[PDB]
Design a protein that fits this description.
The structure is a homodimer of 656-residue chains. With 656 residues, chain A is mostly beta strands. Chain A is 11% helix and 39% strand. The first copy, chain A, starts with 13 loop residues before the first helix and ends with a helix. The structure holds zinc ion (2 copies). One zinc ion binds next to strand 24 of chain A. The site of one zinc ion has 3 residues of chain B, from strand 24. Chains A, B: Its EC number is 1.4.3.21.
Chain lengths: 656, 656
């Protein structure tokens, strides 16, 4: 039996992973099985909390596994109790398909390169059979194809051409789409368009220095350096995966799917350690493309559920992605064979200056009376690559007690071929000759398990509204009166709400069992999110059905153990029909969500209309949302931070 | 005659100011006059452009002045031609009141302190007559009071109490509001509430270290330092007021009213110097409070037009407001006597790291193939104080060609007294015992004079929309189709539009006389603004009438010289009745704004619902909007920037 971790929420160590896989291999003795997922099965919320603050028993270390068996359809999943090295729970799901690992994907390219039918298509497209080594493809989930359901594990290959291995293939997509059987490693069908478009005869749109030197005249001269040094160390303190900074204390976890997982978040309010969130993370996402033409409906990847923000994460060291005195965390997964794999520097932690926290000067002595305090922020981040795109995720903690999620989208646009005399139409943009970048949205589902100042929470929408009384009335004589209308969700159905520019809507997550001694309102953390696009895909569409959580900016359901993934546990190839995930949690919409243990799922993101500026490599596009304490504290929580400058009125006078 | 400036758009030098005032004093020989405003009268748009790019004549240096004459009502304004030292234009406006200078304000406090009636009120409120030196007040424009119109120049004093000079008076407001005659320096009336509330007997809510040490236990220990050094200098180049950075070239101007004014903005697109904006700045603002009770309707200050972001600007040196290798600019105004006054380090310019500009790695060789380029941003900023509040303004230029306006709101909440058994009701929040922070909005009017890739521009609203075709139709089989609906404004009336969350609305400012050779769309800069609150004050209200521009997120009118200030040139005490400012520019809404010289006024800001966290000193609240190039360039404009890391596929292979 492997050693227990330091903390119940720590990810499975490599030893625990081996232990888990050995256990499963034994249980299925004499069966050819392969490992798709071996990850920590977190303790029940209750167990964790009791252990943490009621002297409760240590929760057992459990490992969740997903495997495939040669010749058997679908998958098998279960739990391994590491202490006793045994399978304690197991079941077979023959009509489902699992997340696609790098091994499942890193091999599709070679199979299409060697497929006679694919070769014939390349030849017809203008690439001779002896140049197949110049043909490339990004292996995608087939998403969903009614021609096969989950009856076969499939991938669809978006084909591209490289004139030279160092080229960026995206300026040269081919017009067809092979469909590959993941287990059989072979092409079973190829979607061929009615209107054929042969390879672009243009130069590739490249972005490395040597390419740029040839493209524009030369590179710009290296700019004078901007050095950031922390000579005396950092203010934060890492103890294992536990972080302590500016009164915040939380556990930094990580898994193959969600990537970073922040847990057991609390704030030390001058000795009174107050809980804020039990768990927070990105639980899923979907990038629905808007071209109605076949087979483009199959482009609506749920990167988190179908590839995994953990599995695709970039080793952060080299890129100079994290500037300053960094603290890194590695990630551990399992490979197909059940052996632990490690991706180094998967998460980086650092703190950086963030301008002014607050300031105020008295005009009376010409601002000689003044106090200025600079702000510093705690950043916990990762960068993962979903084939063409790169998602930079930054969890930010601030000195006023706010928590923010900043995402920067970069990488390369998904592209499809465009005929010389073809208009990108209303569905896409011609960002380069013969290149069509299709419209699409980038949507994310933020999962918040709150514990605002303790247990028993509620949620509400807050809308700014003018007084109902008219101009000239005794109640609103000059018609300037306005207030905040708070609608607290009593039932799940009440929470299904969207962002509203008309009222500057924001959402409150509060503890109705307490009151702020000054304001009289319950302590709360307010979600201030504005990049909340409506789901453009029609109701009842493929996209709307497989991502039921995306239809509303906010979804609030009662807490239940293991309610993590909004689009179900096994996303690839699910048609979206059925009661699972968010659709299951919502139920008939009648369960109570007022003053209980609740789960708050927020949908945010952007609607991406490509433009030449995004090609051939896109400048980082920002996305952000934040949670601010409101009525949580009785006053600015950062006033005990040493001002960077401070002069009292009496001091200014005596100073001459 | 004073020496000409280096650049036609430079602010009046101190010598030019003296010259202007001497000239005016002479013209009004034998009259007791005082100077309210002496500032640069910028050259006509045409003149400037012709001079700049057509070998046109140098525009004459002109100074705009506003003066008062003892015994005469209203003001007198005109122009002085500096070259010939003479008044070339002049007129009297007897029914208007001008912007309130620091001199006009710094004296009201003493007049109320010595007023018998005010003293009586203080005594009734619980402050003995011999402690008047402990009574303070923030001198405000009366805003607008139907009892006096513009017939008298008035101020209203928000009264406060300090138990000790080093206290922050805002925890102790008194219940009455004296009304002072600015020219006569005397109290002419006092608004007294029906329900009296005597001074708070609570301790002041203070925020200096000594106060905090007494309040909480002690200050936190100074955190390890975070040093930012630029050992080899900066990449930007300042030539007078002209800035050159990352291909951007623009003129940094500054005046008593708008504060920072960025002009003649262009981008060097590999030798092709392309115009973007002719002028950009904050042209006005309004902070309407939402308590209907008298006399709170008078709280809707237009800080820019009634006090001036220039006049109230903070000398940036000391506070450690600008971190790193800074470049400063001083500001020059005139005092009542016509002598030049200087506020040092009014504007600071610096560049700082801004994370990743872009990145992409190829999963094929496990991300060994990768390119990462860090971003650096150019920041031009100022901080001004409007009595209780501080506004931090940051004009940001980025390496992808985007321009952004970041504002951080800090300082102190406006407060009114609250009775022991009085509820802050729906109009405010009790942020401290006996303290009521009224609801209110912070609204700004961004003024953009575009020249997108040249002359002749248009504007349009862009809305994301689902295909009108239904799910299951040949046109939209799977119902995922969506596009961008562009409504280009033909007439002024068409432009009166608001932000719409339902369509993720954004606005385009484009040049309809050109096309992007790849996308086929006109080059443009897209306004991406989301903090666009609707004006809560009722239609026909005091607030709605004096700030006609605030009713819509966007206002587009034809260009005319001297169309700067949306609420008129002389804002204090204007009732809002009349055809001036934006109401005049809009006219009957029928003038053409399609492919001409246009002016784009954007309303953005926040709706502030106070909470204890904001008191006694508020943590900086963010506000931002940006203008991105879309179809302006033919590809990512920052690709010729040296990557901070780059490894080619062929390089990765040979690297072993
Ligand atoms: Zn995109
Ligand atoms: Zn405010």
């Amino acid at each position: 039996a492997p050693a227990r971790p330091a903390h119940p929420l720590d990810p499975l160590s490599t030893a625990e992973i081996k232990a888990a896989t050995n256990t499963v291999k034994s249980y299925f003795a004499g069966k050819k099985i392969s490992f798709n997922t071996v990850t920590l099965r977190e303790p029940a919320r209750k167990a964790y909390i009791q252990w943490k603050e009621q002297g409760g028993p240590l929760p057992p270390r459990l490992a969740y596994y997903v495997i495939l068996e040669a010749g058997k359809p679908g998958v098998k999943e279960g739990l391994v109790d590491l202490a006793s090295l045994s399978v304690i729970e197991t079941r077979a799901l023959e009509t489902v398909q699992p997340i696609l690992t790098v091994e499942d994907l890193c091999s599709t390219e070679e199979v299409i390169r060697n497929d006679p039918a694919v070769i014939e298509q390349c030849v017809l497209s203008g690439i001779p059979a002896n140049e197949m080594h110049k043909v490339y493809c990004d292996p995608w989930t087939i998403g969903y194809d009614e021609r096969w359901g989950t009856g076969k594990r499939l991938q669809q290959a978006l084909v591209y051409y490289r004139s030279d291995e160092d080229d960026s293939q995206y300026s040269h997509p081919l017009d067809f789409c092979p469909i590959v059987d993941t287990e059989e490693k072979k092409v079973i069908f190829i979607d061929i368009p009615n209107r054929r478009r042969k390879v672009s005869k243009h130069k590739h749109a490249n972005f490395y220095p040597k390419h740029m030197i040839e493209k524009v005249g030369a590179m710009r001269p290296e700019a004078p350096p901007i050095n950031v040094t922390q000579p005396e160390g950092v203010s934060f303190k890492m103890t294992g995966n536990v972080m302590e900074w500016s009164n915040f204390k939380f556990h930094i976890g990580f898994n193959y799917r969600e990537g970073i997982v922040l847990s057991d978040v609390s704030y030390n309010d001058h000795g009174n350690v107050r809980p804020i969130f039990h768990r927070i993370s990105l639980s899923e996402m979907i990038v629905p493309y808007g071209s109605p033409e076949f087979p483009h409906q199959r482009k609506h990847a749920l990167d988190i559920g179908e590839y995994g923000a953990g599995y695709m994460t970039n080793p952060l060291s080299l890129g100079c992605d994290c500037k300053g005195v960094i603290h890194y965390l590695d990630a551990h997964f399992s490979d197909r064979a059940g052996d632990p794999i490690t991706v180094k520097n998967a998460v980086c932690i650092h703190e950086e200056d963030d301008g002014l926290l607050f300031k105020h000067s008295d005009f009376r002595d010409n601002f000689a009376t003044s106090l200025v305090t600079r702000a510093t922020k705690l950043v916990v981040s990762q960068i993962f690559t979903a084939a063409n795109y790169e998602y930079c995720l930054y969890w930010v903690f601030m000195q006023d007690g706010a928590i923010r999620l900043d995402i920067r989208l970069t990488g390369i646009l998904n592209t499809y071929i465009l005929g010389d005399d073809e208009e990108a139409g209303p569905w896409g943009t011609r960002v380069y000759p013969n290149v069509n970048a299709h419209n699409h949205q980038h949507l994310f589902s933020l999962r918040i398990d709150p514990r605002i100042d303790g247990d028993g929470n509620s949620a509400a929408a807050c809308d700014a509204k003018s007084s109902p009384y008219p101009l000239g009335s005794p109640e609103n004589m000059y018609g300037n009166a306005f207030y905040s209308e708070k609608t607290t969700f009593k039932t799940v159905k009440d929470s299904l709400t969207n962002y509203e520019s008309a009222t500057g809507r924001s959402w409150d997550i509060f503890n109705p069992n307490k009151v702020n001694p000054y304001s009289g309102k319950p302590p709360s953390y307010k979600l201030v999110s504005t990049q909340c696009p409506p789901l453009l895909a029609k109701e009842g569409s493929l996209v709307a059905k497989r991502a039921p959580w995306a239809s509303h900016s906010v979804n609030v359901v009662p807490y239940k153990d293991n309610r993590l993934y909004p689009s179900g546990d096994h996303v690839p190839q699910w048609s979206g029909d059925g009661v699972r995930g968010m659709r299951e949690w919502i139920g008939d919409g009648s369960e109570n969500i007022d003053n209980t243990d609740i789960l708050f799922f927020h949908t945010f993101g952007i609607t991406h209309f490509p433009a030449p500026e995004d090609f051939p490599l896109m400048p980082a596009e920002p996305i952000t949302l934040m949670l601010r304490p409101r009525h949580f504290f009785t006053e600015n929580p950062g006033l005990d931070i040493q001002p960077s400058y401070a002069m009292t009125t009496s001091e200014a006078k005596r100073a001459v």
